Amino acid sequence: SRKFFVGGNWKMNGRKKNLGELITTLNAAKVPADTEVVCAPPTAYIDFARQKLDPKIAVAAQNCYKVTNGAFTGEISPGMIKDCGATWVVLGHSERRHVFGESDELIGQKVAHALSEGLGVIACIGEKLDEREAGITEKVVFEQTKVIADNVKDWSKVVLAYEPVWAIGTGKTATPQQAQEVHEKLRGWLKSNVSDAVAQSTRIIYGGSVTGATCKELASQPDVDGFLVGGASLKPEFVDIINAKQ
């Protein structure tokens, strides 16, 4: 079976003081046997985070570029991430897609480069509200994953995150059933476009709004393998989410 995966995306939040406290809280928490825990601190703090965090928890970067070195001021490479002791990178997040307008082609190139360099990838997909209301969720998510799939050689270091963009700051919450329906179709796509083994072993995590209160019902869905957590990553609520499957 698939190891339960819990990622905490800190986004653009925190200073050395309040993050050190957050880290002390996590260091105390007991991590269940079959649970994989990953934190993604702001880029300035990757180094700081890895030095203070217990080796039991992984560190991810929130983004990177697609070559190993070069004239791209303000960017960082997978090699730099590895160099700081991080092992994962989040690629293709909704915020890079829809705020900063990163293209599918570019996300794919980033995926292939980060994997070639030994990093794990959390690859984000999902549809916006205008597209859900038109009835084209399926078309939009599959097209996204084809572009990722076309660039993955070895699926053992890949995690797919579904982000229901249509239900973030819209005043429109997604039900557990609605998450489940999309996770099932994604797994089905992997089954018929890649292979059975890849479909059965690849973890698909839900990156929608999750709280200490909602997490239990979402984690009991058959095709939900864990979480990519936004705002709750910064509170002790995170420790409850880590224990969601018990």
Binding positions for substrate are: 9, 11
Q: Please identify which residue in 36, 37, 38, 43 interacts with its own copies, judged by CB under 8 A.
A: 43
Residue 80 to residue 85: CA distance in whole angstroms:
9
User: Which of 40-48, 134-142, 157-165, 174-182 is the region at the interface with its own copies (rule: CB under 8 A)?
Assistant: 40-48
Task: Provide DSSP, 197-236.
Answer: HHHHH-EEEE-S---TTTHHHHHTSTT--EEEESGGGGST
Q: Is residue 163 among the annotated active site residues? A: yes
Residue 118 to residue 68: CA distance in whole angstroms:
12
Binders of its own copies in range 124-143 (CB under 8 A) = none
CA 86, 121, 211, 214: dihedral to nearest 10 degrees? -140
212 binds its own copies (CB under 8 A): no
Phi, psi of 36 (to 5 degrees): -105, 120
233 binds its own copies (CB under 8 A): no
Q: Please identify which residue in 62, 144, 151, 233 interacts with its own copies, judged by CB under 8 A.
A: 62
202 binds its own copies (CB under 8 A): no
Determine which one of 36, 95, 127, 163 is catalytic. 163
Residue 15 to residue 51: CA distance in whole angstroms:
15
| Shortest Å, Cβ 65 to its own copies | 7
Q: Please identify which residue in 65, 166, 206, 238 interacts with its own copies, judged by CB under 8 A.
A: 65
Whichever of 90 and 114 has its CB closer to its own copies, that residue is 90
47 CB-side CA count, 13 A: 4
| Shortest Å, Cβ 190 to its own copies | 25
Give the catalytic positions in this structure: 93, 163
